[PDB]
Structures are given as C-alpha cells and as structure tokens.
Amino acid sequence: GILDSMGRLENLGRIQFSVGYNFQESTLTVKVMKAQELPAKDFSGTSDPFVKIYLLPDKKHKLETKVKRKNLNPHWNETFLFEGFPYEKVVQRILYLQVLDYDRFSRNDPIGEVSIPLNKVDLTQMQTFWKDLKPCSD
Ligand SMILES: [Ca+2]
Ligand SMILES: [Ca+2]
C-alpha cells in the first residue's frame, strides 16, 4: 500500500527512443535511437542487437530495426512511421520495445524490454526518452 514494487534491477543496459504525432498527416513517429551497455549474449563476447516495436495491445503487427553486428552499444537511429493512424486509437496504445540478440544456429536471445503508455506522452512534439531495459522472461 506504499508502492508497487521495490528491488534490484538486473543490469541489461538502456535504450533511447523518441515518439510524436503529426496531426495533419495522422502519423505516429517512433525513432529507435541507440542502446548502451547491452549484455553479451554470444560466446564470442558480443551481441547482435535489434529491436522489435509493438503498439500494445496489438501483439501481432510489429516493426523491427536492423541488426547491428557485434555491438553492445548500437546506434540504430531508425525512424518508423505509423501513417494514417487515427489519433483516437494512438492514445489507447502502449509503445513496447523488445531488444534481442540475433543468432544463426539457435533462436534469437531476448535481452530486455521497455514500454511507455502513449496516453502519458505529450505527442504534440517529439518526446525523447531513456529507459533501463527490464527483463522480458516468462
Ligand atoms: Ca546468442
Ligand atoms: Ca548473436
């Protein structure tokens, strides 16, 4: 009855991204900028990170960044557009980012996740955020 949770945060790195809405175009922009201090998820001692972008509760339709080979501090600087997306639907979504290590001979390795409800963002301007990656394990 004091707070939701308290505890140690696993050091999974952090990610920077921006989001904003253009009302004339009815377009939501999400820019996945860069990540820092990602863990190594390959026996080579690096990872091959990419980001999956969801607008929850839509768990089916996602976008993805490119894979940055052997890079624990990737700079994607990739811009994604959700064009002709009505504003009244936008504010009902949660922007969800999942960072993974791309693998060749096994399944990709999830690293961590972040999210932000778009109804808590002032989308009239591009807003930029840093968030520490949280565990995305089941
Ligand atoms: Ca791996
Ligand atoms: Ca890998």
Ligand SMILES: [Ca+2]
């Ligand atoms: Ca793997």
